[PDB]
Design a protein around this ligand. Sequence first.
Ligand SMILES: Nc1ncnc2c1ncn2[C@@H]1O[C@H](COP(=O)(O)O)[C@@H](O)[C@H]1O
Lengths: 938, 75, 150
Amino acid sequence: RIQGAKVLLSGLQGLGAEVAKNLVLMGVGSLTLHDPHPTCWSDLAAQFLLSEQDLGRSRAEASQKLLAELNGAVQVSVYTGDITKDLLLDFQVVVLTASRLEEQLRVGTLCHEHGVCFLVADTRGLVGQLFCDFGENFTVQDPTEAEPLTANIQHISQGSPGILTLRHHFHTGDWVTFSGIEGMVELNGCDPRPLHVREDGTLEIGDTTAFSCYLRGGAVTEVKRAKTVSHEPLDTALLQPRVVAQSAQKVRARCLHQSFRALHKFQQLHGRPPKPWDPVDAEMVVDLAQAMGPLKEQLDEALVRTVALSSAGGLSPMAAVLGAVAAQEVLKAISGKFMPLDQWLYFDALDCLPEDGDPFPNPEDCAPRRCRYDGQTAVFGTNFQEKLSHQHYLLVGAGAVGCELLKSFALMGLGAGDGGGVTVADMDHVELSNLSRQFLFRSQDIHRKKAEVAAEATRRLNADLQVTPLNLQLDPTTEDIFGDDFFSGVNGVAAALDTFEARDYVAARCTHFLKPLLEAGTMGTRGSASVFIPHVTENYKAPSDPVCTVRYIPATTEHTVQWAKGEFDDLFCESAKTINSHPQALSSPEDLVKSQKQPLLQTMRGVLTERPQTWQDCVLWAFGHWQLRFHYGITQLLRTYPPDKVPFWSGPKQCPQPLKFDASQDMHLLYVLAAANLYAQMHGLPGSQDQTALRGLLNLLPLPDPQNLDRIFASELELDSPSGCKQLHEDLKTWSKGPPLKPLTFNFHVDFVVAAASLRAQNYGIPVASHAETKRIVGRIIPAVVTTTAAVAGLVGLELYKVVGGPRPRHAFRHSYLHLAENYFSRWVPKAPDIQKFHHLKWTCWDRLEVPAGQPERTLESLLAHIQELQGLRVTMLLHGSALLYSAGWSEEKQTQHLSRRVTDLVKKVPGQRVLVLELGYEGEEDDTNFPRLHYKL
Amino acid sequence: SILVRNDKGRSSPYEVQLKQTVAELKQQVCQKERVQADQFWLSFEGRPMDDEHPLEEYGLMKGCTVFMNLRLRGG
Amino acid sequence: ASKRVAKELEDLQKELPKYLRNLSSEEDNVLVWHALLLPERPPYNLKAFRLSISFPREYPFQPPTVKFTTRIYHPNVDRDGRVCLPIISKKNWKASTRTSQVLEALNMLVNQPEPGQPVRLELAEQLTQDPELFDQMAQEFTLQFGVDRP
Ligand SMILES: Nc1ncnc2c1ncn2[C@@H]1O[C@H](COP(=O)(O)O)[C@@H](O)[C@H]1O
């Protein structure tokens, strides 16, 4: 759908570069750039598309090639003329960046009159302004991020407004549709019906008097209705800004709005932007701001003055955040999804500035110096750049967020100078799925290391900084490289991990080494950026089904998907390895009894006893296993647990039904096709995709009945006895010859699990997972969006500005959570670490006790006495991670034996280790109390 | 009585007292939205809400709104 | 998390329940426990069963796994020794519960099979339809492979 929309983009500063990068990466089929202004040094600090080589050349013309290389399926073009009405009418969305206010109004009036979606994005130092204008009537079709919540019906009542019984949440006035309805065959795909909610949990769907009796099954899904959005033109929105913000931040955003209006007045009246940190220009901007009067409350003149002073810069993180938001709004306009911004969005990042009592940068400190960082030193100064060049940062994860962080680092100049650098650590290779979700990879980079490619690309963005690629992950198994000597030079850690567990480990290491940890995470259009500074803020807190139920009663979609995945795993990956690993089980049943491998081998042997010869012979095995799993097993379950079992199939549980084979049906045919192809590819037989020939073979030679499988398939009661394993070996005597079976690591991989999940879901009445949902659940692929990635990386870079800025109060740092699908953006001050109190002891999540071993290493009793006199509590327990060095619950002899030994004689001496982290428990400890770790120093 | 906006974008009503702690509201959200506690947190007017603190210290007015925010796996 | 596991191992070793014997860790890994469960049901009491309790790195929040090293003929124990105990289920395991309660539930599961929670469905059907043959085969299997009573 997005391919049909053409986007105009005027202004190719770093913000325009971010917008263009996001739009090209998502795959908007057509984009036109417009920025005739020659490249200046003030742009190289934020424009990753431009280098010092293209000075004087137009920004758009030089950046067109770099945009085209990001996505070859996007028509990136340049328009060298003026933005007239004729040019404007050829685009559906027009974005203005780096455009003066009169041009913004002239373009916006035409866009509002002629139905063109209009976006303004601009960043002035640490302040960002975004304006949307999507017309008087814009229809938004999917105002919700998530898919509609499907549910299944237990009973249907007819007559007066019908009572619905369900196996989910609903609201009055909602419209729902029905699928897979038996009995009421006319309700399949019918027009949506209004819904009502009762206090007892049942729902009403209005008049259903003429519809027939409910049979079984049935699924109900609400339809996401469209909504009308009206936006006022920029000519009037300047006087009544409908800025999205919390009740607390409305006034601050309003003051930033007035500050931008005053800056535009300054540009009109003086013809140049304010000189960097010039008090005279700031005072003139303030005077202009106070001259406008209240918006249709007192104005903050200090805020206006700070904005005026800092406005003379262009920052990479600000560009990333605001361009990510603007690109998401562009995509909302193009595809009609989600809710657009009401009218305005103002992003305040002035927290990155030095404190009130600290010296602010001088007017001549921020003067341009003909360097890459003229757009950065214009707000932060030159000494800030010198200290940035000295920073050596560990970036963990070279993924999408990691690559956007690397872009930000190269633009910032982090590690440009001596002693500074970046270390990028990632083990994963560049899969094809990693392209088009990030700009740092191309076709020639496939299956090469992410860290190395990212290092080369970051070197190309800026040759100054030393990006060192390490192809090892960061976990307990890699302590030898990321040890104390590594972190001695590391000033901080930036985390773009794919899992909560890796985040927990890196946060623990950051707490151990007292390194500021910036943490970036995404899911869909939701993103968070956190900063954890030692002794200032809190530590990172990470969040945390059995075959017991999955094997015989799957209650949820996840249960059926896991069952299908395990079936694939043991039919195509595990049992083949079991066969190939040891031929002893294939030559001696006495060892076969001990090995405990009968059922997988029996089900791999199949209904057949001989090795399959051709495709038309191997195809029998697939539907034989289909009959075994989906008919015989459920028949056994039903006969063991009758429908009136003492009933058992009550409440959430319902009586299942066996599946009857029919080649004409899509699901059974797909299951047979996928299973047969997987078996053939394992066995070395040639696979085939001729569905017509396969169905002809299916209906030419079908099984007579499914009950006779008793003569071929042995029960669980019997396969564990010699009588079963003997005949199993007799059947398998021919299976030990020939080449070994090839395991098929998870081509028909997806088709098999999809068919199995659909069959199981229709069997047990749970909702049927779609192709995308099944792929997400079974492959654990993360729903990710490039815009959230860029915004989160920009927020992390903004926190990095304050981390490099030396000591800061807790009120300076911000944690940020953003949800673009509903215009949510919150930056809050993180809390101080919680004070844990235990009698006279007080400690936080960072504290520790440091004790030297000594030139002669002290005994364990000496250590315990030292800690007891230091703290005031007797050590009742001492461990090294998981090995118990000492406990007072021990008998006297064991206590004395362990007390006489040295610590290093009780724990394994890790090579190169200088600090041992020991875990302590004191007398009278309340349960689960986490006492400070002892950093026993050698 | 307040509204809690869940991950799926639906505002669900809950009944809670001023002196009632954020922990009880969080567990009610857990049982109603079928989501584990450690995987989400609550916010009022942008300010995050801690479980140990009560509702009185966060100024939840009558019929106000609270947002759930999921902890993000990564990218 | 290891310190809590050590405290639990201490409060269990200092006073073992009568149905447990020989509780010990690997002396460098307290997160794994080895024990000899002593059944009391007439079929199972003839032998003692080796048992391993594994505590995850996330133990206070993630339930431990109980596994029979000595193969047992039981409806509620999988053929690899996995025990489908309800208390250690991810659905209702709560941080306030302790391994003593887990071993109480395990003892009651071994001494009082509930066939309504199948793991080996054929064994459950055998138990419900011809419990005498279930008892015969279970006694034969436990006597065939079982640790001597300590
Ligand atoms: N413990 C770890 N150490 C280093 N890199 C990791 C670790 N865990 C995940 N990653 C990588 O971080 C990246 C995060 O994925 P994504 O952000 O989706 O691109 C992937 O390339 C992972 O391979």
